[PDB]
């Protein structure tokens, strides 16, 4: 891993653990492996997506926020917003107690990471209905050119966006 990505991995483990969800570290590592294995065309799509990032990032999660992979989608979207220095709305369905807890967990992690990065624009894990959440996710992917599949694909793609943002930071 590059120093910047290793820094983010460690900061995420600290945030995951402090928020009471240390098991998310292993899940993130599986996403890191998937991103590192991405074919050239997927990397090219990630570079093109970063070029299309909006002034305010609006998205939603494609799976239930009471799952580890759903928490990770919300966290990674928040990380993309923080690294791009934009306000963000990350819609989630928070109807059941497990969903509300997952949204609160994602919010705690996202706030810790944004603070560690000095990102001052607001990034909010935002409770909404299924239609709003699904619409925002589809619009985000379509605006960026990212095909919408499963949570694994979205987590991989969001982490590839992160990697591109770090590459742009390093570039001259």
CSV table of N, CA, C and O in Angstrom, one decimal, residues 32-39 43 156:
chain,number,residue,atom,x,y,z
A,32,UNK,N,-10.1,-3.6,0.1
A,32,UNK,CA,-8.8,-3.1,-0.4
A,32,UNK,C,-8.2,-4.1,-1.4
A,32,UNK,O,-7.6,-3.8,-2.4
A,33,UNK,N,-8.3,-5.4,-1.1
A,33,UNK,CA,-7.8,-6.5,-2.0
A,33,UNK,C,-8.5,-6.4,-3.3
A,33,UNK,O,-7.9,-6.4,-4.4
A,34,UNK,N,-9.8,-6.3,-3.3
A,34,UNK,CA,-10.6,-6.2,-4.5
A,34,UNK,C,-10.2,-5.0,-5.3
A,34,UNK,O,-10.0,-5.1,-6.5
A,35,UNK,N,-10.0,-3.8,-4.7
A,35,UNK,CA,-9.6,-2.6,-5.4
A,35,UNK,C,-8.2,-2.8,-6.0
A,35,UNK,O,-8.0,-2.4,-7.2
A,36,UNK,N,-7.3,-3.4,-5.3
A,36,UNK,CA,-5.9,-3.6,-5.8
A,36,UNK,C,-5.9,-4.6,-7.0
A,36,UNK,O,-5.0,-4.5,-7.8
A,37,UNK,N,-6.9,-5.5,-7.1
A,37,UNK,CA,-7.0,-6.4,-8.2
A,37,UNK,C,-7.8,-5.9,-9.4
A,37,UNK,O,-7.9,-6.6,-10.3
A,38,UNK,N,-8.3,-4.7,-9.3
A,38,UNK,CA,-9.2,-4.2,-10.3
A,38,UNK,C,-8.5,-4.2,-11.7
A,38,UNK,O,-7.4,-3.7,-11.8
A,39,UNK,N,-9.2,-4.6,-12.8
A,39,UNK,CA,-8.6,-4.5,-14.1
A,39,UNK,C,-8.5,-3.1,-14.6
A,39,UNK,O,-9.1,-2.2,-14.1
A,43,UNK,N,-10.1,0.6,-13.4
A,43,UNK,CA,-9.3,1.8,-13.0
A,43,UNK,C,-9.6,3.0,-13.8
A,43,UNK,O,-9.7,4.1,-13.3
A,156,UNK,N,-15.9,-1.5,-3.8
A,156,UNK,CA,-14.7,-1.5,-4.6
A,156,UNK,C,-14.5,-0.2,-5.4
A,156,UNK,O,-13.5,0.4,-5.5
